[PDB]
Amino acid sequence: MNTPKEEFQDWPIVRIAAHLPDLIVYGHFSPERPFMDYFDGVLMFVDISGFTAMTEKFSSAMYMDRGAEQLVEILNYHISAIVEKVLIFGGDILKFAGDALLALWRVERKQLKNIITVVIKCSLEIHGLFLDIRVKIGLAAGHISMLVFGDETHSHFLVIGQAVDDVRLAQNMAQMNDVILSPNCWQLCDRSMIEIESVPDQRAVKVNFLKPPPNFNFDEFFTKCTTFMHYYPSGEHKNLLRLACTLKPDPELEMSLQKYVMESILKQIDNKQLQGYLSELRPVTIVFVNLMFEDQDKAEEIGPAIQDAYMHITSVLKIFQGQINKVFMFDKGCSFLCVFGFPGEKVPDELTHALECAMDIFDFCSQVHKIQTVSIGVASGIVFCGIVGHTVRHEYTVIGQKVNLAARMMMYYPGIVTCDSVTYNGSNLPAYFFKELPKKVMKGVADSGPLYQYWGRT
Amino acid sequence: MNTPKEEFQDWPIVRIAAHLPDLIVYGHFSPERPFMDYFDGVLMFVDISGFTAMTEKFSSAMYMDRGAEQLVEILNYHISAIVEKVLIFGGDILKFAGDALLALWRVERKQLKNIITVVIKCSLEIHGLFLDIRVKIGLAAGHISMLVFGDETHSHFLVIGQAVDDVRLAQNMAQMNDVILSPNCWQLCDRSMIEIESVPDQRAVKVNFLKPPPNFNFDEFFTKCTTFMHYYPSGEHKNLLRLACTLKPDPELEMSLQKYVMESILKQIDNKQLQGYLSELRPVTIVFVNLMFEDQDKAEEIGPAIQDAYMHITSVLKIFQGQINKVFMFDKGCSFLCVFGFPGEKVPDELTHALECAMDIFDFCSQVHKIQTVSIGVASGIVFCGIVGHTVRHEYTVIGQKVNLAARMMMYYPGIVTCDSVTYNGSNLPAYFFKELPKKVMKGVADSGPLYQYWGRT
Amino acid sequence: MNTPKEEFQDWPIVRIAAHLPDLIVYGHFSPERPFMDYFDGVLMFVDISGFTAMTEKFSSAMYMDRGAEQLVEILNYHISAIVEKVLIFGGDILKFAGDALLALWRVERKQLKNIITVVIKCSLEIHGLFLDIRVKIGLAAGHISMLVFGDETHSHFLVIGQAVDDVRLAQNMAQMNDVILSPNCWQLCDRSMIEIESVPDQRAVKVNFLKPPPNFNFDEFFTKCTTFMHYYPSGEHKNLLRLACTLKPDPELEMSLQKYVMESILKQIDNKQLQGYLSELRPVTIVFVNLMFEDQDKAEEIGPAIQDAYMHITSVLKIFQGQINKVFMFDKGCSFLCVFGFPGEKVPDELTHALECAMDIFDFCSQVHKIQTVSIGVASGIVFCGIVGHTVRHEYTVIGQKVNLAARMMMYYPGIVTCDSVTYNGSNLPAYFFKELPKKVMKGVADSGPLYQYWGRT
Numbered sequence A, B, C: 001m002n003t004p005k006e007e008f009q010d011w012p013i014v015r016i017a018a019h020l021p022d023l024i025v026y027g028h029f030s031p032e033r034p035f036m037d038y039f040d041g042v043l044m045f046v047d048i049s050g051f052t053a054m055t056e057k058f059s060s061a062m063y064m065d066r067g068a069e070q071l072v073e074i075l076n077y078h079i080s081a082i083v084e085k086v087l088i089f090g091g092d093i094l095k096f097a098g099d100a101l102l103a104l105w106r107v108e109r110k111q112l113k114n115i116i117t118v119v120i121k122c123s124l125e126i127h128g129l130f131l132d133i134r135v136k137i138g139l140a141a142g143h144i145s146m147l148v149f150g151d152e153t154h155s156h157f158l159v160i161g162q163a164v165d166d167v168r169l170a171q172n173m174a175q176m177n178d179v180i181l182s183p184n185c186w187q188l189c190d191r192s193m194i195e196i197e198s199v200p201d202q203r204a205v206k207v208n209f210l211k212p213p214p215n216f217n218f219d220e221f222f223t224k225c226t227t228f229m230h231y232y233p234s235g236e237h238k239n240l241l242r243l244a245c246t247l248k249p250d251p252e253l254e255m256s257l258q259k260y261v262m263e264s265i266l267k268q269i270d271n272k273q274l275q276g277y278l279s280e281l282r283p284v285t286i287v288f289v290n291l292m293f294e295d296q297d298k299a300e301e302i303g304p305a306i307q308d309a310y311m312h313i314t315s316v317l318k319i320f321q322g323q324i325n326k327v328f329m330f331d332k333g334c335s336f337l338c339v340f341g342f343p344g345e346k347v348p349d350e351l352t353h354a355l356e357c358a359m360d361i362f363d364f365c366s367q368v369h370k371i372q373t374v375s376i377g378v379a380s381g382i383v384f385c386g387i388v389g390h391t392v393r394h395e396y397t398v399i400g401q402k403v404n405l406a407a408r409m410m411m412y413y414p415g416i417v418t419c420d421s422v423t424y425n426g427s428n429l430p431a432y433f434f435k436e437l438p439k440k441v442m443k444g445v446a447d448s449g450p451l452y453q454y455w456g457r458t
């Protein structure tokens, strides 16, 4: 009797799970929204520099209109190798945000110290790996909360808390190839192993070296650490990057997971549109909404407010096929990256609508309980849209100078709705709905043309 | 000199042969239609229950319009494993009929007894395998005839005869996890091996156990049996499920095989339409035509009559892009499962045309020599349409409560054209073309709304 | 720590390189056009017979409109095996021209003799391999020049010189399974190894046998020869057909390589159109342009003239979406195979435009310095268009009786623009723009209907 080889089965549930972390794939939580959960772990925030400039350059005529295709190939080639190192070292990629990602090693507290050593080693192997593009890495460790929010058809998650805020601080202060440890990371870690320098005006710290003691054996140390990693592929599945590669069809799980993924993506997953259709350099409008709270680490207070905000944002965006691309925590606050003009979703009057939608969101969210300040940046132009990451873990994302600009506007011009010149000039609206603003110098943007506040009709 | 690995070549002839059994792939028969051939073998008729109810439920809004996609994934996941067991045990899957299949082990008579033991073991391993869904299995053994019929562009085949009628009886009388043997099966089999119970009002029989004698070794027994299996993958190809995976391009064979497969399928095979396009929950009209004969086991009489009927049915269906989905033998008669509204084939006035086409078929076929009774059931609604089975053996099929309803109407209301309420209400036709019928209780249907006879214009 | 298997990555740069030889993939030459380079090597020109007749026959109704699909499958099945033998024996496939290909073994002069023995052995293994279709093979050895020409968006290359002219002569004089060696090939080769016959009225020669001396061991001899093959897959990559299978994304290289490949092909490479869309039997018009020179082996003279011609041809074709399918050297001259009606590029008035474009090209090119004679054949009808070759090395090509006819017209009616009856009858133009020509018997065409010269408006 023959025993023929099982072919890899590439079921839709497996393709959907590529878009999600293990935290969600194997999470099985309740129905209620907001849902919150609490744990400890180590975070790695890996940021690549030089890609939005490449994006700008790949719009140039030398790429003969294969700009999007060439950009995504070279981006995925580099990012895939980072993703693979993270997975092999036992991390869960939580989210891609443009050309950056955030990864988690969830463990019990007693194991944090040993796991911090695993993540440092991983970081230094990634730095190793590095077209003129650098990588900055922040690491943090401690308490983390997860929030899941949404409605009957859509779900979103976020991590929140002091380690989350720390990991962004640590990354922001890194020079152009540094691994920086949060102060808490630095004090929980195994100091006899790691050689650091102080850094100016902060107790956060820079890693120079991993100097293991005499007969420390990393492979034995790692194996010990795997005892505490729930989903590390092993045994018969040790040749796989992710256990989620082995998920089997299960309608109830697939219904829960698909809510996290955008419809146009699901369509490609179902072999109902060409795989190449979602990689594009297209003109869109970014509406970047920032919500700040009294205490942004306190998930039981902020969770309800984010749910409330999401219910309203989703309904006004729907009126324009606008879409939420991603949600995440910034140093200040919860940010919704919203996009008008995603593929097949091109209403004309995009700019006008982007502005009215932004005002509506600003007015509603301002009155939501616990939301201290709302800030919204609106910028318009040619951005890269596409699937970024590795075949086994990847997400739909947007990269471009205009995405960066909208993000910086909401930070540098808090408490108001701001817009760029393309949006101002291109909108239908009367000029006195706007106020021209003082020019501010902003991190990693040059030649923002004039900026405007969208005042509305006083 | 390098010896690089041959890549699996997935030629169109290989993809076409996935849709056909070995009986046809390696058959090489004459041109004439009808063609008949005679042999012996064992049949297994495996029926899954619970799928048309799942079909109904997957139309619900909780599946967020990925109903068809989720249904086909979970159906193929389970059905694939059954297909694989059948192939590994050396069977030929002849046909899929909704959520049921029919499999054949063709052998010389002297070998029937030993082969019956192989098929029982296979059946019990399939029962093993079993969302709330059961499997019933009928087995039969003895004489089988095959009929091939059609025209210059289309071919169809059917198995006919006493073992065929038996295998349906045996399956129909099974409780909700039984393996039932036909009476002839029971008397040809190796009684010292198999432990049965009698069943009420029949000499057909239920298998409880396979109790091999002391040093019976199944693997050695199976290998002996493979001597009599012409196409069992072996040698260099022993890691394959089917020898048809190794077919090489051959224009003459491919022209003969493609006649059995629907054009829209061929289009996907040729990479001229998206693979996902044929999995759908769509509104269609089922026209189920049943032909009964004096003697339905006598292939030399009935073959000409089925050919004649097919020539006419095909021409009237063509006038409406109606399509024959499948043909097979029921307990009484030869059934054509015809469908109006298959993809890209959506004439409006579908219902009216379904009725006129049915009357035309009824009038012509009634006068064909040797056809004793014609019965036709017409039902309309949302049915699943798609490719069911395993990657190496699969077929386009329709599953749904309306498919079941049309099948039961033609059996419970013999000799007339019947239709459901959707068809009656939705058609263009005047009310006095119909007669409202007495309500009958019918196997595995509830809430058939009112039923009508299509009388035509007296 | 796991070491999971790297998946084959099928990056766009790798798919583009399938369309090109190593001579271009690993060439890295300057920007300037024309670019010329000089080397030595052995050429093999493998011609299949019987395919354009199969093409004709696959338009017949017996193929049920899957003619193109069946033709390409059976063509690629046979051609793939030839390609594979050529690659395994260390050759570079330079170009496909319908159902023929040209392959190169580039080496230093001292190694030519040993390499000639490798190529003969390869030839005899290919002859081995051979629906009623024969293979003729010409071999030549010596000096070869390569010309690269084009503009900012498109590149083309050609090999030129005495070995190139020789390899076509040798192939043209072969009977219907011969391997013929050019005279220069015959005198550089290892005469103690190869058993030949003379052939009528030529010092070119026919191979009967390879009779290696007593303890000649071909595998050891081949390995020695691999020392001189720059890109022979080896080591970790010895299970690959081509080293180009390992190319990694690199925007600068990909921009240079994509210029050689047609846009519609790039679109399929980018997963923006169905793979099956480019295999078709479609009506097109072939415009075959032949340029002759005083000395066609002298690349420093002819290179500028071909560049000049190309700049003009490309601009007039653009005005009609006409396309250059391929360029190559014929026994006399440089030929541009141009096509009107490639997919998505179907202007009506195709025939008229094909004629005016041809006249324009004829008038301009006639005055280009160093171009002695221009000849252009225009023929219209159903031709096969599609990707021919092996998965790792393949090209878009056209095959058909009309392609052959246009090629023969430009040779048998030199110095003028000629057209077939379909073109004459179907064009819009007044009858006195044409002159009906004397009927000539032409190699491998029968029933060319009447032929005409396109005179233009005197």
Ligand SMILES: Nc1ncnc2c1ncn2[C@@H]1O[C@H](COP(=O)(O)CP(=O)(O)OP(=O)(O)O)[C@@H](O)[C@H]1O
Residues within 6 Å of the ligand: A047, A048, A049, A050, A051, A052, A053, A096, A097, A098, A099, A326, A337, A397, A398, A399, A400, A403, A404, A405, A407, A408, A443, A444
């Ligand atoms: N797709 C995305 N998702 C979330 N945030 C994004 C984003 N694209 C841009 N941003 C935000 O825009 C800001 C850009 O500033 P930086 O991160 O310092 C740019 P950089 O990494 O030095 O080089 P780059 O522009 O080549 O990416 C960040 O705050 C980042 O969070």
Ligand SMILES: Nc1ncnc2c1ncn2[C@@H]1O[C@H](COP(=O)(O)CP(=O)(O)OP(=O)(O)O)[C@@H](O)[C@H]1O
Residues within 6 Å of the ligand: B047, B048, B049, B050, B051, B052, B053, B096, B097, B098, B099, B326, B337, B397, B398, B399, B400, B403, B404, B405, B407, B408, B443, B444
């Ligand atoms: N695609 C198909 N091809 C052929 N016959 C079909 C069919 N779909 C339904 N039928 C017919 O419809 C009838 C349905 O009755 P049953 O077979 O008893 C239903 P069941 O198996 O108990 O559960 P189910 O409805 O979940 O399938 C059968 O006679 C069957 O032949």
Ligand SMILES: Nc1ncnc2c1ncn2[C@@H]1O[C@H](COP(=O)(O)CP(=O)(O)OP(=O)(O)O)[C@@H](O)[C@H]1O
Residues within 6 Å of the ligand: C047, C048, C049, C050, C051, C052, C053, C096, C097, C098, C099, C326, C337, C397, C398, C399, C400, C403, C404, C405, C407, C408, C443, C444
């Ligand atoms: N796609 C293509 N590219 C370049 N030249 C082509 C071509 N198709 C046809 N030709 C030319 O047309 C002519 C055809 O004549 P032959 O090569 O003798 C035909 P054959 O090989 O005996 O059988 P065939 O017609 O089945 O191919 C050749 O000069 C060839 O160069």
Ligand SMILES: O=S([O-])[O-]
Residues within 6 Å of the ligand: A094, A095, A102, A157, A158, A159, A160, A164, A327, A328, A329
């Ligand atoms: O990674 S969470 O802040 O979206």
Ligand SMILES: O=S([O-])[O-]
Residues within 6 Å of the ligand: B094, B095, B102, B157, B158, B159, B160, B164, B327, B328, B329
């Ligand atoms: O399996 S045969 O009755 O179509």
Ligand SMILES: O=S([O-])[O-]
Residues within 6 Å of the ligand: C094, C095, C102, C157, C158, C159, C160, C164, C327, C328, C329
């Ligand atoms: O092979 S070169 O003459 O195009």
Ligand SMILES: [Ca+2]
Residues within 6 Å of the ligand: A047, A048, A049, A050, A098, A099, A100
């Ligand atoms: Ca960045």
Ligand SMILES: [Ca+2]
Residues within 6 Å of the ligand: B047, B048, B049, B050, B098, B099, B100
């Ligand atoms: Ca069933």
Ligand SMILES: [Ca+2]
Residues within 6 Å of the ligand: C047, C048, C049, C050, C098, C099, C100
């Ligand atoms: Ca040829």
